[PDB]
Design a protein around this ligand. Structure first.
Ligand code: NAP
Ligand code: FOL
Ligand code: MN
Ligand code: MN
Length: 159
């Protein structure tokens, strides 16, 4: 099973100038909880924006170019990325935009955080067909002293 996990601002914005223009520690805790002890697949731009290996996860990077860091696994196609994960229950795809686009057709689950923030962006989550997905979990949170915006955690499963 393949799952996507992402945080979306208004209009499905997910990034700007290779960074995320918000700080929501609650969402990062959610990200960590849902990805720990699982392989994570990311594109090269996302690897660069993160800047180091994510601990306690097998880090797999998609690049058409040879790898430049042996602390992570480098693969050159979607099929190789999947094979590199082995036989695990759940593979987590952590973006960015181009990688989300390619793995969406294969995904059975989406872990989405909807953030009530208006940000200009240059990267967007794919336009997924809402009829194909069932919402099985949602949990809304108002803003607080640590999290500057309200946000909703949602898990959707392909029908
Ligand atoms: N809000 C969120 O949940 C979230 C999550 C993740 C990322 N982001 C944001 O998204 C942005 C980065 O996304 P992005 O779309 O620009 O880049 P990306 O998808 O992270 O990486 C794109 C790169 O991945 C490699 N790649 C993708 N598909 C491949 C394939 N099939 N075979 C071989 N290599 C492949 C290529 O690297 P080469 O050029 O080396 O071939 C490509 O240039 C940043 O702003 C980041 O902060 C946001
Ligand atoms: N829901 C969600 N939120 C995100 O911010 C997010 N970010 C990416 C890619 N960007 C990043 C950037 C930083 C870290 C990170 O530093 N996480 C650490 C710390 C967790 C914490 O602070 O509690 C980790 O161990 O996962 C992860 C992904 C992909 N999917 C996401 N999905
Ligand atoms: Mn080596
Ligand atoms: Mn807001």
């Amino acid at each position: 099973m393949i799952s996507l996990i992402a945080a979306l601002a208004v209009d499905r914005v997910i990034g700007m100038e290779n960074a995320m223009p918000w700080n929501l520690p609650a969402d990062l805790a959610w990200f960590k909880r849902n990805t720990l002890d699982k392989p994570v697949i990311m594109g090269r731009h996302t690897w660069e924006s993160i800047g180091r290996p994510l601990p306690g996860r097998k880090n797999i990077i998609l690049s058409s170019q040879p790898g430049t860091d042996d602390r992570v696994t480098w693969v050159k196609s979607v099929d190789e990325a999947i094979a590199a994960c082995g036989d695990v229950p759940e593979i987590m795809v952590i973006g960015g935009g181009r990688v989300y686009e390619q793995f969406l057709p294969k995904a059975q689950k989406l872990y989405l955080t909807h953030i009530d923030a208006e940000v200009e962006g240059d990267t967007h989550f794919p336009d997924y067909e809402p009829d194909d997905w069932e919402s099985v979990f949602s949990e809304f949170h108002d803003a607080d002293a640590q999290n500057s915006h309200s946000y909703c955690f949602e898990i959707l499963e392909r029908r």
